[PDB]
Structure 1
Amino acid sequence: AIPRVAVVVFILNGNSILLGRRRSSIGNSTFALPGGHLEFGESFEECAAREVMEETGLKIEKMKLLTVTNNVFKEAPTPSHYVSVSIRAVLVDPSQEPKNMEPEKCEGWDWYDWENLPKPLFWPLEKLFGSGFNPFTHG
């Protein structure tokens, strides 16, 4: 069991970010960002765009590094440890509608306003926001 790298993406659209409820052994039914495992040789930005495309169909651009978090799930059915690298991005076409391209892993994607975020948030996301982190203004 070793720590595994994931990239997670804050897609900023107006005052909103894209979230979707997980269908997963970890954080089931909680609202989370699009994202996934970093592949060998891939950059953070390449991973962000690929994962967003694979999961939502959305085309993003202007990717920027935000932060990194350490997320240990010792009590999961398969104990897991993720190191999650967060990336900010925007839509190439702000009118583009999300699709649920991996519908066995997510209930669906929707936009949520920064001042009216849904609950329950996936714990790594809630914990990060609890530190005061704001993807619109960070860095």
Structure 2
Amino acid sequence: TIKWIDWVKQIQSIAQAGLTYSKDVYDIERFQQLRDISISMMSHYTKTDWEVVEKLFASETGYQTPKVDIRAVVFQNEKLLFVKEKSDGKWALPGGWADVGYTPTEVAAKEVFEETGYEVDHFKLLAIFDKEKHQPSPSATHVYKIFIGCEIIGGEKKTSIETEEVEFFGENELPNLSIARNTEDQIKEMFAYMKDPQKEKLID
């Protein structure tokens, strides 16, 4: 693996904590210098514009925790609901970044409605995966993925600008997965839950 990336992510994290919590004017200035070195290291070794890296890597406030992604797990006739993005042509469970000001089930409901047309409720906590644990490639960011089971209670299948196709798929007919949005192993775990819904919940 690339060892340097996880070191630099930890330096930015501590610098971000220092800028939030230090009250010492010379320590605040040391934490700002350290964040700026972290941007410069990322900028040079990924050949990415310095100011772009600052926005993508080093503009959060407060203590730095992993980011939260939500995936909705909706079955019908033992087939799992997937949505295809028009631009990249790849498939994933409905979901996305958790919006500030929304609870996890509100994110699941809103993402399912916007991407698929369906109304959902009857939320179940299924799993929390650590995106980095067996990640294919190195990442600038650390993500926890919360999988929430839901029941379709209304609305109707509807495509959009972003969302070209909405379809259910059986476990021996999976479409081309967006590995960034969901791994094969995360999908296999959801079919294991469908077969035995009283099973232990996966937490990385």
The TM-score bracket by the shorter chain reads: 0.7 to 0.9
One-letter amino acid matched to 2:130: N
- What RMSD over aligned residues (CA atoms) do the two structures have, in Å? 2.6
Tell me the residue number matched to 2:104: 44
Tell me the distance in 2 between the aligned counterparts of 1:39 and 1:132: 23
Q: Which structure has more helix as a fraction of its residues?
A: 2
Equivalent position to 2:158, from 95, 99, 105: 99
Offset at residue 71 of structure 1 (A): 1.7
Matched, 1:90 2:151: yes
Q: Which structure has more strand as a fraction of its residues?
A: 1
Matched, 1:15 2:96: no
Task: Tell me the SS of whatever aligns to 1:68.
Answer: strand
Identify which range, 15-24 or 123-132, moves more after superposition.
123-132
Which residues of 2 match residues 65-84 of structure 1 at below 5 A?
65-72=125-132, 79-84=140-145
For 1:45-76, what per-residue CA distance to the aligned partner results, in whole angstroms no more than 9, with x for missing partners?
11111111121121012111100112247557
Identity of aligned residues (%): 26
Task: Tell me the SS of whatever aligns to 2:118.
Answer: coil
Equivalent pairs, count: 129
Tell me the distance in 2 between the aligned counterparts of 1:54 and 1:82: 22
Distance 1:11 1:55, change over 3 A: same
TM-score, reference length from structure 2: 0.53
Equivalent position to 1:121, from 169, 173, 177: 177
Name the larger-Rg structure. 2
Task: Tell me the SS of whatever aligns to 1:122.
Answer: coil
Gaps of 5+ in 2: 1-56, 58-63, 200-204
Higher RCO (CA < 8 A, seq sep 6+): 1
One-letter amino acid matched to 2:178: F
TM-score, reference length from structure 1: 0.74
Tell me the distance in 1 between the aligned counterparts of 2:72 and 2:129: 13
Distance 1:58 1:132, change over 3 A: closer
For 1:63-111, what per-residue CA distance to the aligned partner results, in whole angstroms no more than 9, with x for missing partners?
11100112247557xx443211001111104xx532123x23x331111
Distance 1:133 1:69, change over 3 A: farther
The answer to whether the Cα contact below 8 Å between 2:73 and 2:190 also exists between their aligned partners in 1 is: no
